[PDB]
Subunit: 388 residues, 3 copies
């Protein structure tokens, strides 16, 4: 029994209100500029020669001694083309202990006609012919055919195609015909199928937070304030500021030259562990909420089924009628348009995601080849051999 006489309140039911949230999903319409060229479009070829022109006219003669020089002769454009096309380089003659008669061959304009797939020079000298000159001439050459990845910069507006050097220096790509240049021993030639830039109109997904966090394939980036940003491989310019001349957001060039430490990655692992625990808390709070609902719903059905003996059977989708022997225990015996009370929609699910990992510029085959060639030169110029 209870005490209907006197009451307390009046009361109301407290509703639960979700916390507002400013993250949305956007399909941002951008112009995405690309400089993609696939295949082997880059040819690097070096060639130099060691010269040792000596004269032995006795210790009294002021001209007694050697004249040595590492002279670089990088191949011409046409030379580099046929080199790569044949994957062999052409050089002059290997001269060893050519004295007075044959000593003049140190200066001939040799008209390179000696073919090699790979050829490393030898640092040999000789001055053991009295009152006579002695000439030694060693040659080095190599060629490679690789795939060069061209990046994008701004220097203002209107992004520009650019080759990045391992040291950080940029070399703009010729947009007319076959950018070719020369540096010391080496000559570089780049020849893509089509010149200039390419761009498409496309919608990239984003999460609006003031802050835009976007993805485009394997590229993941923060979209800036004024809707214009350049990544290494691509530039994204949001129309609505299509007709506006803006300096885009610029990626850092050191981010592609300088590698990441193991600690930096472990730092990313610990940040992921933190968000994985974070999410486990939220999932636990939601699982507790379902527990509370299941307990409230068991109590509620236990009350309504007392009036509607056809209820529990409907909840179990079995024909049966309910008979309570206790306020908590019961017994079971045998037997157009719609209305949406919930307005629930398909649950958004985080889609799978895998970032792009391309490495550092120095590890590229083209720059690897140059670095090894220069390392081979340092290895062979360690000491002089006697061409006697």
């Amino acid at each position: 029994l209870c005490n209907k006489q006197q009451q307390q309140g009046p009361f109301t039911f407290a509703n639960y209100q979700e916390s507002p949230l400013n993250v949305s999903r956007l399909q941002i319409k951008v112009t995405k500029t690309t400089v993609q060229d696939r295949g082997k479009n880059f040819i690097i070829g070096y060639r130099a020669y060691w010269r040792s022109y000596c004269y032995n006219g006795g210790s009294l003669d002021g001209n007694t001694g050697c004249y040595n020089s590492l002279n670089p002769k990088p191949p011409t454009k046409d030379e580099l083309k046929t080199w790569g096309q044949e994957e062999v380089c052409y050089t002059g003659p290997e001269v060893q202990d050519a004295w007075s008669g044959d000593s003049s061959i140190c200066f001939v304009d040799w008209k390179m006609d000696n073919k090699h797939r790979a050829k490393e020079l030898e640092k040999r000298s000789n001055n053991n012919h009295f009152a006579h000159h002695t000439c030694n001439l060693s040659w080095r050459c190599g060629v490679t055919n690789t795939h060069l990845e061209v990046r994008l910069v701004a220097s203002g507006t209107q992004p520009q195609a650019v080759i990045v050097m391992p040291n950080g220096t940029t070399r703009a790509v010729s947009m007319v015909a076959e950018t070719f240049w020369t540096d010391g021993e080496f000559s570089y030639l780049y020849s893509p199928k089509v010149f200039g830039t390419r761009a498409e109109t496309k919608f990239i997904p984003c999460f609006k937070e003031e802050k835009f966090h976007c993805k485009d394939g394997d590229n993941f980036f923060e979209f800036p304030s004024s809707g214009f940003i350049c990544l290494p491989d691509a530039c994204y310019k949001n129309e609505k500021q299509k007709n506006n001349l803006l300096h885009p957001g610029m990626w850092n060039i050191s981010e592609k030259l300088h590698a990441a430490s193991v600690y930096d990655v472990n730092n990313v692992i610990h940040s992921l562990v933190y968000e994985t625990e974070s999410l486990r808390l939220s999932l636990a709070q939601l699982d507790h909420r379902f527990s509370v609902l299941t307990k409230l719903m068991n109590k509620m059905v236990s009350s309504l089924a007392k009036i509607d003996d056809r209820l529990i059977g409907a909840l179990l989708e079995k024909p049966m009628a309910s008979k309570f022997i206790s306020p908590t225990k019961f017994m079971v015996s045998p037997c157009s348009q719609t209305i949406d009370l919930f307005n629930f929609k398909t649950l958004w699910l985080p889609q799978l995601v895998a970032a792009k990992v391309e490495g550092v510029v120095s590890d590229e085959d083209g720059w690897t080849f140059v670095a090894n060639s220069k390392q081979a030169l340092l290895d062979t110029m360690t000491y002089t051999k006697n061409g006697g």
Copy 2:
């Protein structure tokens, strides 16, 4: 009052249906092959000598000059074993300005008996003894005892234990006795406790998406079509295709030689930010759903408690009876088997995860030692000293 006369419909309640999803959890039974050898099992030892055999018989004599050579003498297997066991290397004699009488010591078969922990040669030459020979002989040697990590390849079926060189070249491990080899100045000896391969039968967890995304400890990988894949440290072969001879999925060798750029990692950070916002949306949609349910349940209880004054007391687990002074306000006064209406099961929770980070091959101590030794040689062969 209302207008019972005329109606509209008939209506039905719209149920909410979850979107079907093809991700499941699998416990895939695989044969996992391992080549793990723990401890210091690798010994690298270099030894070479600088020789400068000169003769000064005046500028008229054709034999006047030096004969110099950097000759490599890598230690034998037994030499390398005792070197590492004592962490000291043995070399020949340090010869300085030994002329005509003692000049013959440039060729003796020195029978290395000079012990050093570390010894770097000196590039000294001398030809200032007339009508006489002069001999200079400098020696270099070093030894290291490290732990070598052996990887796995295919070359077909039946994965094979392999040592990877920094340049990308593979050297198969001898599965009989103590793989040993020699390259220039250096000799390498590897000696594990047990030979061949090891494998166990074990169940790796996976998420079936056509696509299998699996984890095995700190290893995380995509399981291929035909259930056979080789990682650097291990190979996983699914039985059911245990008795089938297949080429496994092969990891790329450049992925372990070439480091990742800082940009690649920031790219991973932005991809994680995207999925973190993604998940925050889904969590927000679920929190809104609970709000809707709490509002629908407050309305429902407000209706049932009008009939069952014992309800609200049961929902609050307090003995009390309800008395409504308004369709929304009320007053409160004092006072075997089971049936599962929900069929809810324990909520799956994403378990913690931390990837393995091992670094690049060049950073290994063994290859670091070789690289520094070769760098020390380039530093000392810069110019000649006068052993006068």
Copy 3:
């Protein structure tokens, strides 16, 4: 009709119970020690000279030959300060083919007065003056002003400010005045605004799992057992063990020198894919649960609205009364304190997170400068030029 006669049970409703979970959120009060110094506070400057003192007194004279040496003369503290302040280095004289009269200039105590922004030496020698000495003297020098990042170690208790060398060697920072040192050609001077260490009292968030997974800004780390750990940039010491002298948790020094491979990063990608699928399962299980609730609630309302024709109108917040023409179809006609049945609280949401990525020590500008300077020396000492 049904069969009230005989029953079965008695039954009870099965409640759903959440699985207990030991993850919590902690606001751990720590003392965080910092050594942060912003701006250009580091000056590296090298200087050496090539000397070639030769005498040509004929092949009979025992003194005939050259005396060559690469001698390092690193600048003093005051020299380095004015060098960096002017970004130019001072050296001695460039001497070329100075013979007997002027040959004595190879030893003068030159009192460096030749200014250069950048100056690389030349390896030229000459011995073609009979009965006379010949002197050649080439100079090299460079200076840089960079920002040095100082790390933290333990060596026991009481963390210490430390500069890390690319080879792994540590150099403690002088906490009195302007740590300066010298190594071969190079001299290093570091001059921060304030000396010693800095620390603040602050609360870092953590997830308690035995295991503590914490975050502090862009730093993410596992908090150890005894509440004391040192990262490269900072040390965190939990009070409650403020007055206790403990060895902190020490980061590995190789983690900041050795880069991460592309494979290590792809491994992190696959681990993220695994947890992204993992979370998609849990989100799917929760979405199925809401489906079940929506079906149970549609059945329940369909039963209660039979008694309370004002219910469905309240659930739709529209004034209307319900009239059922079928146990599933109906027709619609026109028309202080609170009580919390749920005790639901604001849903915790995983906040955004971006790790810090700083790179490797070798890629620092200061050590990059030293490495390039030493590489330039190896490039110019390749062969001798004739200063005739």
